[PDB]
């Protein structure tokens, strides 16, 4: 990533590692180490991601939003 990784990673049901970074991005890493996708937020992502029962990825950000991102990397909603 392009910033300090304070956030703690979470693993999906297929092995995908989700973690946020201080570079504002939420990363989705494949189990082989190759990047799946990255989602940009308005602030550093100190918050640790969490995965729901349907594979959605929930994480907060320093930009005051709680982001909900689909496993394809597209934004579902944000509070």
């Amino acid at each position: 990533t392009g910033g300090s990784v304070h956030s703690s990673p979470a693993i999906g049901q297929d092995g995908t590692i989700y973690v946020g970074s201080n570079d504002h991005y939420l990363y989705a890493i494949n189990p082989n180490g190759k990047l799946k996708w990255k989602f940009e937020t308005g602030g550093s992502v100190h918050s640790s991601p969490a995965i729901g029962q349907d594979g959605t990825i929930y994480v907060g950000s320093n930009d005051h939003y709680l982001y909900a991102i689909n496993p394809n990397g597209k934004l579902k909603w944000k509070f």
Copy 2:
């Protein structure tokens, strides 16, 4: 929310996303992105919520308390 989301979200058995915020509130978000309820504490909620076997939501706060909130948003107790 009205503050940086440092706290990390937790998902209940029905999909409800629980996360604290630096605006002193503990938020309960529905899986569709609409707010269920919010509980106000005396300080920023850096602590990440946790869900017990009965659906209770446990989270700490900068106000020195460990809050226990019922899934309806009403305070159970606080230590």
Copy 3:
């Protein structure tokens, strides 16, 4: 507690809520809100506790140690 609760709580198999505090203590709270025990460490407990398969409680502390505490509140070991 006597300090900001930055650490995130963990729930044991019987409902006991374990969380650290900035007052150096690791707290064990009963599901009814009454204190079970508290274990003193040499520094603030920002680290979030974790429970092993045998009910042990693992948590770090600002005093550089990784504490292992038995569910009765007595120290097992510390690294």
Copy 4:
């Protein structure tokens, strides 16, 4: 460890406790308190480790990398 343990521990399927430290190292502790191995990173490990379905240990670090370490302590990859 040789630094403040801000990171939160994780337990593997055999009881091994994984936690990072502000001394740049990621520690693997046996359930008896004896050190299994330690992996050095370029910065403090505030991030909390996470274990995949195959026993891999994922953790971030202040050095901007998301580390993937095999349970034997050898580096799998890093993003």
